[PDB]
User: Fold H(+)/Cl(-) exchange transporter 3 from Homo sapiens.
Amino acid sequence: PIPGVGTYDDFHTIDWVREKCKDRERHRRINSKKKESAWEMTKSLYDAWSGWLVVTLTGLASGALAGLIDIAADWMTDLKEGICLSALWYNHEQCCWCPQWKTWAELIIGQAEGPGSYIMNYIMYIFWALSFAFLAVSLVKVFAPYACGSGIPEIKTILSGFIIRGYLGKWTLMIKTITLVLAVASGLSLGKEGPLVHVACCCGNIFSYLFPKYSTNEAKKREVLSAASAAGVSVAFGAPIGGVLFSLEEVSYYFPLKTLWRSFFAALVAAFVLRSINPFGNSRLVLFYVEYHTPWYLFELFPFILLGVFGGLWGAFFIRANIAWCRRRKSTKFGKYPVLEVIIVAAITAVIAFPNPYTRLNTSELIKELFTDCGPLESSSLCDYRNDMNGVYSAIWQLCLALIFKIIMTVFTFGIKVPSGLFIPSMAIGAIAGRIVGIAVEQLAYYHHDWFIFKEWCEVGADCITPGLYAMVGAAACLGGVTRMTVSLVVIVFELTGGLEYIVPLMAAVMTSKWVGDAFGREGIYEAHIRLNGYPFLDAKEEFTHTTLAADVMRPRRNDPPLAVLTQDNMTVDDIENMINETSYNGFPVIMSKESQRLVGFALRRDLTIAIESARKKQEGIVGSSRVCFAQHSPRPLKLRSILDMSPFTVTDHTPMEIVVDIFRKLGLRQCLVTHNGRLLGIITKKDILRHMAQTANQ
Amino acid sequence: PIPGVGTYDDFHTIDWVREKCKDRERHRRINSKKKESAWEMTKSLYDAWSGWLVVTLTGLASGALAGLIDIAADWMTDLKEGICLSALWYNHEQCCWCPQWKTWAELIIGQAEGPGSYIMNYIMYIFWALSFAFLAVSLVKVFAPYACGSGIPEIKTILSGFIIRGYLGKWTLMIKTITLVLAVASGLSLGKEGPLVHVACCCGNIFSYLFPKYSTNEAKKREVLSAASAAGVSVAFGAPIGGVLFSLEEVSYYFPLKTLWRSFFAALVAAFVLRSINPFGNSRLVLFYVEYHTPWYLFELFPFILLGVFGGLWGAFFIRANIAWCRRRKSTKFGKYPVLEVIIVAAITAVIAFPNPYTRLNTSELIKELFTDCGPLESSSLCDYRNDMNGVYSAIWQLCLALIFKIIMTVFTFGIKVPSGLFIPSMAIGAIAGRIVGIAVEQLAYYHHDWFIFKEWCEVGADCITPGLYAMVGAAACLGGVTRMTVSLVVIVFELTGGLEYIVPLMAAVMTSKWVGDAFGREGIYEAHIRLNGYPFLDAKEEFTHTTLAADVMRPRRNDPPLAVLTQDNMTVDDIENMINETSYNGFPVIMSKESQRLVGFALRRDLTIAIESARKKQEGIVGSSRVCFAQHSPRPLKLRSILDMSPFTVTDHTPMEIVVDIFRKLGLRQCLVTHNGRLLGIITKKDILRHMAQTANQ
Ligand SMILES: CC(C)CCC[C@@H](C)[C@H]1CC[C@H]2[C@@H]3CC=C4C[C@@H](O)CC[C@]4(C)[C@H]3CC[C@]12C
Ligand SMILES: CC(C)CCC[C@@H](C)[C@H]1CC[C@H]2[C@@H]3CC=C4C[C@@H](O)CC[C@]4(C)[C@H]3CC[C@]12C
Ligand SMILES: CC(C)CCC[C@@H](C)[C@H]1CC[C@H]2[C@@H]3CC=C4C[C@@H](O)CC[C@]4(C)[C@H]3CC[C@]12C
Ligand SMILES: CC(C)CCC[C@@H](C)[C@H]1CC[C@H]2[C@@H]3CC=C4C[C@@H](O)CC[C@]4(C)[C@H]3CC[C@]12C
Ligand SMILES: [Cl-]
Ligand SMILES: [Cl-]
Ligand SMILES: [Cl-]
Ligand SMILES: [Cl-]
Assistant:
């Protein structure tokens, strides 16, 4: 057809059936081309390998970017505490891997220990946090506004067919890559693991621009984006299987069979890239590499389930809190000052985090410490009480304070105009809760070994209880409660920790949290953010009442004027242009005759206008007076049959709306023409269905 | 409607849309019921938990049955070599865990070592193999003919909507459980891992009857069956994640999001049940628990890729060979003697297996030995050469003979009328090939360490090459080549071996095999067997030519007589009964009037006859003369509007058949009514689509 036909405007959903049709047509054209010449055969071979090439490129880019982001974030976070003068590039761990590393008090005051030294370290920590937060927020605001947030909700919307031009562009990729490091260094209650999914998706789109097959077709690009998201999760947690599971379960609306293996290969490639730079570019959580000698016991499930509950409860709170706060940001005036809000939040976070050791420590390092088990070699404060008796109260008090601080700050941190992730904060909260619960259980076992359960399961005076396992279970429970992921979450946690023996516990806790979350609402944080942003997302959970019928959702209805229709013949180009300008319809039905109202096809408004303009430019005399004939082949009438869709999806008025919604979800229909007695009556658009579902939810 | 309405006959596909509609109606009824009484609330709570209960029951039963089958198979297989008189229940390993265990030569001849002892052991081995094979085949033939084969192809067909009454019944479960042990003990080239999926599916189907929700609805039962298949794979390989991946990728036509977590929970429950009885009921492959000290090196990929190629090639051969042989069994007279064929095949297998040590050893134990690495503690013959220099030729010769014997015997073993699995033979062939390749690579490294690759990657005089990893890679490659599974296979292998370091190699090899297999055909062994059996399976790969249109596939066509249709009114019950008897159509369209040909609905033949008979019994005077009115409410006309489907799926004649196939696959439509100019013209049934695809394939 005319060039530009089939293209989609910004902020508009795609029609998956049409995309598959163009993909099939292009495949047929290439199949016929091969026989023509050997160069055509080579081009077809390249096209067949285009999927492998694009997924490999996306995985390589995701791994490299994840490594660079990890290294830069670690160095910048260590920069707050001090500086390694001997090796400026080296961070605190590398500097001491110490006299070379000097705290800011040593740099300025000259005294490593003292009230003035502590005060100066406090001010410098706050100043560095503020500087990093301000730089991040300014960079997002100036260059790439889309770089803010995790991006998982927008990726979910896009993979459902939605289009957000510039979200996965080069500008967003670069700005998000820099701002993730800046925000993580700032000490805000956020993580970079989730946003790596968006980073990988941006890389995948950029590489898809290279291959004509994926660039031309939106559905193919969305499969590439699903593979990219799998690779992003893999690099985030070193969980390629977990990444594939997340892609299938969370972000991929449609997950064909081949896309599974493509995503797995991309994730493995990205993980291998990270491993090649190991351990420089691998987060210490990704390199947890720790095991618990004592196998988990059946009675320990009861605490784990409890943790599960807590997780769910916390999620039920967080989804209710953050959303509300976010809604206020969208409704109140404080959302008009993103830079000021970010700076203030960073200031409060640093101010309350510096006094407490756990909060001051970087969140990923705190999660690592909590997951690590206690032992004679370990000198962590958490184990001090175990060394003292076998102060527990002081450690528990500090851990509870850190838990409360993290819980309160994550609500006000998620949603701000900087790249923020919820995975790391949720894992930290759950890990602190699990560490507290495990410490309590160990103390109960040691003090009350006379109990038959403790005596039978654990030998008298034996450290059967491992706080690290409890912390891992709590982190998984909190993540399940907030995100509502069930299997992908468990596999990701297992791959991050490497402990298969603890698969059964984790799952259990996760499920409990999920169920508890479902008690207060079946919508996850990502889904809630999708709804808050107003994106056109249709989900399987959403459903219509049985009484609802297609006639109810028909666009023309009663109050609205008669729906715009196009006669096949006897219509001028000026008439089509006037109809295009008058109405904002995604497309117009085309009928045999005005009186007959017999559906002939459905011509997209964009395609109609593009074809009319291209014909005007190509052929002289088309001043709008010439007629347009949608039928198959002086006036020189314009032919618009090519743009016309000859087999639009048709449903009856008496059809239940549940079947219509199922058709829309399975086939990804942009619109469906409701016809009565063989004649056109109305159109039900995905926008209309989404509007009706939103109205039902608001009720 | 009338009782029995909506039920499906045997060997008939189900309509997923209708199943979902009845599920929604039942859910609405229960939702309204809860408010009526507290007992209704408790019933609704039970119904909501019915999925968890059914999946838990399926997992428990699958784990218990897998453990029992493993124990019985191990004991029976050891029975062939000899007997433990001191403890008859104990097998060879348990007896020596030796003087207590006595070979049949000791029992009869009285001499443990001697030419007569070897001869007698040979005869007793053959006799036990024949006895077990005869008992297995007779048990399948007499009680449960469906117990034969792996059952994965039939489960694939069933999960696509097909109905095979009795396949998942109690008789099949019991007979298959006994016959799997009998066949595995017989020494035939088959495994019990794959068939365990069918066992789990039978357990799930049996348990579904307890819960009304799953028993009443076929689609719900099929989700339970998907969870059951995941649990079966989990027990087979101790790979719950691999089990879920297999369920999603191989057997589940539709995999809703909730079914993912349900399958994961069922698999974990079954694996935990196996672990509780550990190590008695766990196959030694499931308890491989072995690691390779030397990490895999990049150059070792080149052998692995080579192994991949071999795998694919072997698969391409096997699918072409076995199918052909299987086809001969269906076409020739030797398929009329299943007992004789089974006995003869067992005789040849035992005769050629006894002389060679690897073949005589049980296939699972041979796979374990091949996967295990060589070391000073190990006394295996495979490592003898390594001890001698560091006879290799003798070990390689024996391994090659075992490879050829297994490859030839698996072709004639798969498809016989006994429970047989392809997973274990495929892994055995691949493991033997990988062990040979790894031995060759190690010998090259030791002899030619001067090579820059070997010297750089491996220190001079260092055993960097690990034959166990090569054997694992070869097993994965062969399994990928024959089954064509990509991600589930890799995850299953990883969980079976427990080595996450070797995910990248495995995948690589698997990929190569798949690609190589795709060079000789894109249909796997299960798909090829589905096609051979003639089951009505529609796959995404199958597609129609662009020129094909709905009118081409319309049932009435030209030569065929006018399609049967039912007038809404003015028709007698005798007329409907006569139409039912005359035609074998799944259902009849109902129209406003004969002349108008305006589609009103679609009434299933089964529903029509059931409603007519039930009305005749319920109401007197219905002797066939009374008229039937399909319209909404002395003659006392019968009302058949309830059975009538008021919103049948309708498509246009000029529609491309590719869109029709996509609609059928996504929505699982039993039939689609092709209407032209608002009037009914024909029907395209899933049977018609499958027939057209089969015709295209035959060409
Ligand atoms: C267009 C995009 C996909 C290209 C991205 C290429 C990236 C992944 C490349 C560029 C430079 C590469 C690195 C260059 C050097 C080394 C040192 C070597 O001992 C291990 C691999 C390692 C660490 C490479 C890893 C992969 C790497 C980071
Ligand atoms: C926002 C981020 C990217 C900016 C990072 C810049 C950092 C590394 C810069 C900014 C200010 C710098 C310090 C400024 C002054 C001095 C005193 C000198 O005698 C030693 C180096 C030292 C202590 C510098 C170390 C590096 C430093 C901390
Ligand atoms: C209706 C179906 C699902 C019920 C199946 C129940 C099965 C799974 C039950 C019945 C008997 C049970 C066993 C009974 C005793 C023991 C010993 C204990 O130290 C470990 C668990 C173990 C080994 C149990 C495992 C589970 C088991 C095998
Ligand atoms: C098909 C399968 C299930 C049948 C299993 C039955 C097996 C275990 C039976 C059949 C024949 C039996 C043997 C027959 C005779 C004797 C001699 C006696 O002095 C010791 C026991 C011994 C050696 C028996 C051991 C058990 C035995 C091997
Ligand atoms: Cl994160
Ligand atoms: Cl996130
Ligand atoms: Cl098997
Ligand atoms: Cl099998």
In short: The first strand of chain B starts at residue 82 and ends at 84. Chain B touches chain A through 51 residues (CB under 8 Å). Chain B is about 60% helix and 5% strand.
